[PDB]
RNA sequence: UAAGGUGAUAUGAACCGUUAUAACCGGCGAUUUCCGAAUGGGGAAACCCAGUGUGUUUCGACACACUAUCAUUAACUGAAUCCAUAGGUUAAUGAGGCGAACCGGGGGAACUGAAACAUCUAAGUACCCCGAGGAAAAGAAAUCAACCGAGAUUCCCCCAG
RNA sequence: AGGGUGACAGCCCCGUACACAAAAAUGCACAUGCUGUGAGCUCGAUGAGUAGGGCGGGACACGUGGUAUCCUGUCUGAAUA
RNA sequence: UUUUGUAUAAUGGGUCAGCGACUUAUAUUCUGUAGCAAGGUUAACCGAAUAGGGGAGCCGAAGGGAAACCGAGUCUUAACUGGGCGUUAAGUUGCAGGGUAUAGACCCGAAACCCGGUGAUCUAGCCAUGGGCAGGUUGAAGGUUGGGUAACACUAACUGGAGGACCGAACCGACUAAUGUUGAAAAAUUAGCGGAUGACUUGUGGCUGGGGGUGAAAGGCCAAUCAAACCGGGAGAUAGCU
RNA sequence: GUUUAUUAAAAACACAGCACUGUGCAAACACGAAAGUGGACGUAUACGGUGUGACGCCUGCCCGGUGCCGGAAGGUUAAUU
RNA sequence: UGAGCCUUGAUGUGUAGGAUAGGUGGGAGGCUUUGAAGUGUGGACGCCAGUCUGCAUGGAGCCGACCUUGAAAUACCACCCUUUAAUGUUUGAUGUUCUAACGUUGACCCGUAAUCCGGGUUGCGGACAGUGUCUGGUGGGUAGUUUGACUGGGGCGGUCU
RNA sequence: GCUUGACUGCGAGCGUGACGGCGCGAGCAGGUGCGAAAGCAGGUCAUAGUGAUCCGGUGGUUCUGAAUGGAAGGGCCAUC
């Protein structure tokens, strides 16, 4: 599903609105990126589905500290 | 990104130095290559550590380097055996171990490496120039007069 | 507890019992086919077909038990690839499905009304979905107030159509 | 109270008020015991891709209106008693 | 009943019986009636439970002005001879009733819109796997021979057995006519008619699902239902109409 | 050959053939929020769409409009800043 | 190939003049052997007077109160304003190249006696493509709807204050 | 010929309209013009020459100003 591994972003619903305002159901969908992240305390590469928050949230939290937010909420990776 | 180095990059920095560098350069190349590693607030403690524990380890010996090489004007009087002849001029040599244990008699350490002699061999009853080696860069001082024996 | 009893249509038959194992009532127990989450594999539900391990046999064949999936943890093991990791096998624990309403959340109409209609309305209603509990949610001020002070949340009546 | 009994029963019957009652299991309360969870003091510490902002939407009685406040899909991004 | 007007040949009713339509709740106003009265009355709740307590509140006793503000006056204007609204009138709470408002709002009744499901045992198309086409005809290519060219070209005979080929049964279909039209039958029967080795037909099973399918295309068909199926729900939709 | 099962079998649909156009393959295109699947285990002598509709003689003038293709100095022009 | 900016090297012709006076202070001489001053001349600038610069050999000298002059010497120091050359350097466009993101419905290896998937090695592309948010255009492909009344029936016409 | 009464605030009372509204209006206050003065003048001989409300705009006005001082916005007056 479309979701972020880190944030857990998902498509949020809403409303498109004309001038007229017109209102139609539409969805906001995430920045979702498959992203090969370097995992230097394990000595791999770890594939996460992620948003771009998500990869600016691993930059600042750092992906060790992530992953383990990760495997501490299922979430194999 | 603001991140150090481990090693030297070609149009960036050196060894080691907070730099601001693209996200994608830092995190698609420098960190997963060993060419760098964020700050992190540890890592301005932690890799910086080769710059900390290095200090921490590098520190009281700039001190060390001064004390090892002052007390070699107390005496100024040293002389030591060997042959020599007429002229003033020697008949054998001078090595480094003719010095090392001729001066132990002054306490503090001393030894054959630790001191430099010169390429000529001081063949003379005459002052010709010595040094010792005791920190790399700063000289220590070395005369000692041959006993013209 | 008892002189009456063997459920009903429902009579009859053959019997039990009457001073305490008749029946009846209550508690703990026992048995509890097959299907069905159905869980050993399959399948047109109540059927078909196994595997393993024990213990039985007159050597024709019998009886019982275990064998789903997923998750978690553990042990053993184990690639490409030296390490490792994926992956594999087993054990143990737990879940699975049903169910009226209430609850919380994820999605979300239109008729209709506006005396037409699109903003708006209907309505976050109906409906679908996930999850929980005896209630749930909410909850101990980064709240209000007005220079006086109140002192978390929830529900009721006013404030006020 | 009621319900029955060959028509309408306080006294025919079952019952009702009232008084009593459990081998066995169990509930909710109490007391008490084993096992695990930690108070009390003292000094420290005070939740960052967060608050806030731009864009688009939603929610707040409040339809973007002069629109505060909450939520956030996207891009950003502080101070830290 | 509806109408200007109905014996009307305008509507409705075969008959009887039974059921079948102005309600309920809350707000609001007017009337009546009762209580108290410049005061009336409490709500939730407490409970000594239809008591009593509770006066938080609501209305009324003052209005004018957009408002500050003023106040039996106020506003207006620089100010009124003035002018407008007001002062000179008891209200309030129950009970009953008449109206209004919100609710299905007197009852019945649409076509339809939307949500979620059920359906390809009919039919349409496709997929796979199996089957069926009596009998009779025509006689393509090619082949062979004779004939003919320097050799190819070529022409009778035999052979051969093509074809969305011919006639015609099963089988598949349905052009005409009659019958029947509360039928034997919610599409048939009778006589004739078309195709009948193919783009054929048929059995079994399977796939496609509703603004979707499928369609050699008729808006045809999708279980006797199709210019948006069926069932359930929104739902007592709405109905200025009958 | 096909068609309005149940008032229309036809001059309607289809048809071989013709042309125009799209499509270089992860094809266009289509079903699908997606994954994927068809197209096709095909590859421009192929595939999709459109129109015409055996065969024969042929298919004339017009690119102003609308679309389609292409071109690009200038003008007009969104978010953003 | 566009621009800011630590900081320095160039920019200062009312004219008096020895001839190219932003300015206050710090001060009386600054540089010249990690080379003075004299020559050719480098590509700049210029009021047509020379300012400062690249280099060659060079090897003991150009530079004030100077008298004048509203101003006293680029003699040194220093913040600073008109001007104007450069780069460590910030982000702009284009072009080229790269690889490490991303892609791969190329080959090969393993998981795995698997044309899925994943990982691995490799090649090919490669900051493109592709996707998200935002945005302009297109958009009966789809949806919701509108499309008046009077009227010797309606429609056409005419009319509507 | 002179001028700005095509004035400002009000308005007894009438008229005409279902209403919205429209119209006529002496006289009063203030200020003006014409005229020696009486007086006349609140547009044009009259009756057509027009458009509600909403939403805004402009100017004026310290009426209001969501703690308070301001401001925003709102109100009120004039006009679009
Ligand atoms: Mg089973
Ligand atoms: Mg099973
Ligand atoms: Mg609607
Ligand atoms: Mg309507
Ligand atoms: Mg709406
Ligand atoms: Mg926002
Ligand atoms: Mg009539
Ligand atoms: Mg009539
Ligand atoms: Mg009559
Ligand atoms: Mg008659
Ligand atoms: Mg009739
Ligand atoms: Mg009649
Ligand atoms: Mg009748
Ligand atoms: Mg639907
Ligand atoms: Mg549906
Ligand atoms: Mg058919
Ligand atoms: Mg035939
Ligand atoms: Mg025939
Ligand atoms: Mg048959
Ligand atoms: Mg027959
Ligand atoms: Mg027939
Ligand atoms: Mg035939
Ligand atoms: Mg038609
Ligand atoms: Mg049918
Ligand atoms: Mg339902
Ligand atoms: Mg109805
Ligand atoms: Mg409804
Ligand atoms: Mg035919
Ligand atoms: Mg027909
Ligand atoms: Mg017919
Ligand atoms: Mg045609
Ligand atoms: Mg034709
Ligand atoms: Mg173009
Ligand atoms: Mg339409
Ligand atoms: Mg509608
Ligand atoms: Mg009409
Ligand atoms: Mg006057
Ligand atoms: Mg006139
Ligand atoms: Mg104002
Ligand atoms: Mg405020
Ligand atoms: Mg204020």
Redesign the pocket.
């Given at each position: 599903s479309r979701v972020?591994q880190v944030?857990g972003?998902?498509?949020?619903?809403?409303?498109?609105?004309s001038h007229?305002?017109?209102?139609t159901?539409?969805?906001?969908?995430?920045?979702?990126?498959?992203?090969?992240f370097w995992v230097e305390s394990?000595?791999?590469?770890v594939?996460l589905r992620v948003?771009?928050?998500g990869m600016?949230?691993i930059?600042?939290?750092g992906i060790d500290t992530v992953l383990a937010e990760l495997?501490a909420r299922?979430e194999?990776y | 990104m603001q991140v150090i180095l481990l090693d030297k990059v070609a149009?960036?920095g050196s060894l080691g130095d907070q730099v601001?560098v693209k996200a994608?350069?830092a995190?698609?190349?420098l960190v997963?290559?060993g060419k760098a590693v964020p700050a992190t607030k540890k890592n301005i403690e932690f890799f910086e550590a080769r710059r900390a524990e290095l200090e921490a380890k590098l520190a009281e010996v700039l001190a060390a380097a001064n004390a090892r090489a002052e007390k070699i004007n107390a005496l100024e009087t040293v002389t030591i055996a060997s042959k020599a002849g007429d002229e003033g001029k020697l008949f054998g040599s001078i090595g480094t171990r003719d010095i090392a244990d001729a001066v132990t008699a002054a306490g503090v350490e001393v030894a054959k490496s630790e001191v430099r002699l010169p390429n000529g061999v001081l063949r003379t009853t005459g002052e010709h120039e010595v040094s010792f080696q005791v920190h790399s860069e700063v000289f220590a001082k070395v005369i000692v007069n041959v006993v013209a024996e």
């Amino acid at each position: 599903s479309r979701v972020c591994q880190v944030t857990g972003k998902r498509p949020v619903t809403g409303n498109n609105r004309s001038h007229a305002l017109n209102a139609t159901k539409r969805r906001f969908l995430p920045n979702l990126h498959s992203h090969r992240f370097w995992v230097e305390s394990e000595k791999r590469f770890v594939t996460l589905r992620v948003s771009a928050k998500g990869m600016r949230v691993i930059d600042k939290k750092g992906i060790d500290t992530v992953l383990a937010e990760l495997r501490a909420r299922g979430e194999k990776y | 990104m603001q991140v150090i180095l481990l090693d030297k990059v070609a149009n960036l920095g050196s060894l080691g130095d907070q730099v601001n560098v693209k996200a994608g350069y830092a995190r698609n190349f420098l960190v997963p290559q060993g060419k760098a590693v964020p700050a992190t607030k540890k890592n301005i403690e932690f890799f910086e550590a080769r710059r900390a524990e290095l200090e921490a380890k590098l520190a009281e010996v700039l001190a060390a380097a001064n004390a090892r090489a002052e007390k070699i004007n107390a005496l100024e009087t040293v002389t030591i055996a060997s042959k020599a002849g007429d002229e003033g001029k020697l008949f054998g040599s001078i090595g480094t171990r003719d010095i090392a244990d001729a001066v132990t008699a002054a306490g503090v350490e001393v030894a054959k490496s630790e001191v430099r002699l010169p390429n000529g061999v001081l063949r003379t009853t005459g002052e010709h120039e010595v040094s010792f080696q005791v920190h790399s860069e700063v000289f220590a001082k070395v005369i000692v007069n041959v006993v013209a024996e």
